[PDB]
Design a protein around this ligand. Structure first.
Ligand SMILES: Nc1ncnc2c1ncn2[C@@H]1O[C@H](COP(=O)(O)O)[C@@H](OP(=O)(O)O)[C@H]1O
Ligand code: NA
Length: 284
């Protein structure tokens, strides 16, 4: 029953069918936030999945049992989707959200709940989102790469502007219950990143569990795990016949997608938007 259209909530674009004024509004206003609750927030296609699998492996201290038997989307449910983690009985609760800070669960700000925000090179996010839209049922066709790029720069896509998203959420940097990390940092030193996240969550791991979290967190291990690779999804929601959720899993694929002209227009957009921002791994 997916149209591949957008509706708006507080001025932000949401895919029809998987979201509704109610589901979003409920996520925004719920008072149900707990001190040991864990949230993973990202702009779509930045590697949410990667992070979800890593923390599921950490919570079970390295035992692959849980990630092998339960679908990735049921282990870290979305807060705003029609079937939200808030609209369910299931602690320690692990949840996911793509909502931009000005819409995310307000009760969070005065709580002790933890949040890991993950950022990825917007260019690579563009490519991942481009391909994914073709096989994702809730998303309309990208159109030409060039038109898709313009849409992305205008924030005419699910969850709005990538620039607004990351800039808003970085406003939390400094609070001890907020960790900011990037796809590039995980690609560069997965183990190093896993230890760092263990510290953040107050969940130390022996050399054994650690090696195990790293092993089952690898792209190849994950693409190979049925419960984790989205292949149990209805073809009407994700066309398996035509593509995979876990597409390439690398850094830099944007250079094979952007024409030089597109790459130069993007840098102009980026330069204006990120004027006072700090330097990110992907800033070359
Ligand atoms: N373990 C892993 N290692 C590297 N990339 C991973 C990964 N798990 C997921 N990804 C990548 O994260 C993107 C999906 O993001 P999200 O989960 O936020 O929607 C995909 O990028 P690509 O399309 O570039 O391959 C996917 O391959
Ligand atoms: Na689609």
């Amino acid at each position: 029953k997916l149209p591949g259209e957008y509706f708006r909530y507080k001025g932000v674009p949401f895919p029809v069918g998987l979201y509704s004024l109610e589901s979003i509004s409920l996520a925004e206003n719920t008072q149900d936030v707990r001190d040991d609750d864990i949230f993973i927030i990202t702009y779509p296609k930045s590697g949410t999945t990667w992070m979800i699998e890593i923390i599921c492996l950490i919570l079970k201290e390295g035992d692959p049992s849980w990630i092998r038997s339960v679908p990735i989307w049921e282990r870290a449910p979305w807060c705003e989707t029609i079937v939200g983690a808030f609209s369910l009985p299931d602690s320690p609760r692990l949840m996911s959200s793509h909502l931009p800070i000005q819409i995310f669960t307000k009760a969070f700000f005065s709580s002790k709940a933890k949040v890991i925000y993950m950022g990825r090179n917007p260019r690579d996010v563009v490519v991942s989102l481009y391909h994914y839209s073709k096989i994702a049922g809730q998303l309309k066709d990208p159109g030409t790469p060039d038109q898709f790029l313009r849409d992305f720069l205008k924030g005419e896509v699910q969850f709005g502007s990538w620039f607004d998203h990351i800039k808003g959420w970085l406003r939390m940097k400094g609070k001890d219950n907020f960790l900011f990390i990037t796809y590039e940092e995980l690609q560069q030193d997965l183990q190093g990143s896993v230890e760092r996240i263990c510290g953040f969550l107050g969940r130390p791991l022996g050399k054994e569990a650690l090696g195990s979290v790293v092993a089952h967190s690898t792209f190849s291990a994950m693409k190979a795990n049925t419960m984790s690779n989205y292949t149990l999804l209805p073809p009407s929601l994700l066309d398996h016949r035509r593509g995979a959720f876990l597409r390439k899993g690398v850094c830099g694929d944007w250079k094979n997608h952007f024409t030089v002209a597109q790459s130069e227009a993007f840098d102009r957009a980026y330069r204006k938007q990120m004027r006072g921002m700090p330097t990110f791994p992907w800033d070359e």
